[PDB]
Design a binder for this molecule. Structure first.
Ligand SMILES: CC(=O)N[C@@H]1[C@@H](O)[C@H](O[C@@H]2O[C@H](CO[C@H]3O[C@H](CO[C@H]4O[C@H](CO)[C@@H](O)[C@H](O)[C@@H]4O)[C@@H](O)[C@H](O[C@H]4O[C@H](CO)[C@@H](O)[C@H](O)[C@@H]4O)[C@@H]3O)[C@@H](O)[C@H](O[C@H]3O[C@H](CO)[C@@H](O)[C@H](O)[C@@H]3O)[C@@H]2O)[C@@H](CO)O[C@H]1O
Length: 454
């Protein structure tokens, strides 16, 4: 039984050995291999995985970073044939938007987790503090309208971080990204949807960055946001508000209330839509240098199709963390063991449709989810995936410049009125910027042109 090496983002569960022992009972039997998972953390997952992939390291499975760029670098196994056999079952369950968003030169290199194919960005509020301090959030619709409630929590509970964001944070908006959000190129969904634009020059987005900087100056965001490895545990009163992606797989605020083990209230700030990001939010890839591509896909297939296996990991050990509710099909309740770091997250583990539904999820939530999924629309740029063939060096150059300046801007640490012009000047200094922008606009023109009937 070879050991299959999987890399995952974020922090290791405290009972990983138990989780994997439970999981490997099923995997070893069905596949003849043992899964091992190594977790790489949150704050620097991109940098870490870039060492792994650019070095051609042996691994079998990974949660992808910079998927569209690396797929064109040949970092990942083409899954075209594996999806005809080992991954046939998981593949049948994917919404067409997952195929559009993850197809690169006519080939799919990822197993995306079937879950929030559409979603919106939300502020998620700590209900303990809302109730304790009686703070009114009914006006909260944007980064800007957040200000009065952060001012209040700051005055009332000085030990609480008002807005908990960390170094990986990027302000959200109604944008589609033809590459990924570590680059500035977006389609503005509220603007001219035929144009590729620089997010730092979109007026309202520049305004958000100003807002974040004012929050940073006011002490609403951590002083060391740009460098901190501190997390804000969903269960703890260390934070008042944070930004969360929510979609139909979460059943409204039930999932965040379950994981936080308290009432979490949400407020949307972006449109609920299928767009490149929502289809790429959890992609598993197989290393193109893997020596076990078939068993790797068999594991990914099981993670996405076997409810015993998936629930065992996402809920944790049955009996300790959760139990089936008698005479209610596919319903569970969590138990004391589930409280904290003793399970994995559904969104980056496997098809959320095969997850048991927890007791705290209401019939209204179930009906809302069904309705939201049925009505979700596609962004006009869903499936517009930028081809890097002509701009390989210029893309690297842009990414290099971005890595060096973008954390201080995105977190509000530096004044964006000073920093954005410095970043733009550096991006333009050797013309890598202009070349990539023009090529992206030319491809986008073709993409849109070819959908119009002759
Ligand atoms: C409840 C649930 O499972 N919800 C999921 C969503 O998580 C998922 O959205 C995606 O979420 C990832 C992960 O971010 C969240 O989890 C991070 C880890 O939290 C856990 O571990 C911590 C210890 O490391 C614990 O402290 C914590 O209790 C928990 O155990 C967490 O750190 C993160 O919150 C921080 O970071 C976010 C992002 O910067 C920031 O907004 C927060 O304020 C806070 O500082 C979250 O709680 C996330 O990485 C994904 O982000 C990418 O994709 C989105 C959507 O495109 C982009 O906007 C964003 O810029 C990133 O590119 C995404 O948000 C959804 C996916 O559909 O599925 C739900 O079911």
């Amino acid at each position: 039984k070879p050991v299959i090496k999987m890399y995952q983002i974020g922090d290791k569960p405290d009972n990983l050995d138990e989780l994997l022992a439970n999981a490997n009972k099923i995997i070893e039997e069905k596949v003849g291999a043992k899964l091992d998972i190594q977790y790489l953390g949150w704050g620097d997952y991109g940098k870490k995985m870039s060492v792994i992939t650019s070095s051609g390291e042996n691994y079998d499975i990974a949660f992808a970073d910079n998927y569209i760029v690396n797929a064109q670098k040949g970092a990942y196994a083409d899954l075209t044939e594996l999806y005809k056999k080992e991954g046939k079952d998981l593949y049948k369950a994917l919404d067409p938007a997952y195929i559009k968003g993850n197809t690169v030169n006519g080939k799919i290199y990822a197993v995306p987790v079937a879950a929030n194919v559409a979603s919106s960005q939300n502020f998620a509020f700590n209900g303990t503090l809302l109730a304790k301090y009686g703070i009114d959030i009914s006006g909260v619709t944007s980064y800007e309208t957040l200000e009065p409630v952060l001012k209040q929590i700051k005055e009332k509970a000085p030990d609480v971080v008002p807005f908990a964001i960390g170094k990986v944070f990027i302000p959200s908006d109604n944008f589609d990204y033809p590459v990924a959000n570590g680059l500035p190129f977006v389609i503005d969904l509220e603007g001219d949807t035929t144009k590729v634009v620089n997010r730092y020059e979109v007026p309202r987005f520049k305004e958000h960055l100003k807002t974040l900087h004012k929050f940073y100056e006011a002490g609403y965001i951590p002083k060391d946001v740009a460098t901190s490895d501190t997390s804000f545990d969903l269960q703890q009163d260390t934070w008042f508000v944070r930004e969360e992606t929510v979609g139909p797989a979460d059943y409204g605020n039930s999932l965040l209330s379950r994981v936080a083990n308290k009432d979490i209230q949400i407020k949307p700030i972006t449109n609920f839509i299928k767009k490149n990001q929502t289809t790429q939010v959890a992609n598993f890839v197989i290393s193109n240098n893997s020596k076990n591509k078939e068993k790797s896909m068999e594991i990914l297939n099981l993670l996405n199709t076997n409810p015993e296996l998936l629930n065992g990991l996402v809920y944790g050990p049955e009996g300790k963390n959760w139990e089936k509710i008698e005479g209610k099909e596919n319903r569970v309740r969590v138990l004391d063991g589930y409280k904290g770091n003793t399970h994995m997250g559904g969104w980056n583990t496997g098809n959320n449709w095969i997850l048991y539904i927890n007791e705290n999820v209401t019939d209204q939530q179930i009906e809302n989810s069904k309705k939201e999924l049925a009505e979700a629309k596609e962004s006009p740029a869903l499936g517009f995936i930028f081809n890097t063939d002509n701009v390989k060096s210029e893309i690297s150059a842009i990414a290099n410049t971005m890595q060096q300046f973008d954390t201080a801007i995105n977190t509000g640490t530096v004044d964006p009125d000073k920093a954005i012009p410095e970043l733009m000047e550096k991006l333009k200094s050797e013309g890598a910027y202009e070349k990539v922008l023009n090529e992206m606009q030319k491809q986008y023109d073709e993409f849109l042109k070819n959908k119009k009937l002759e």
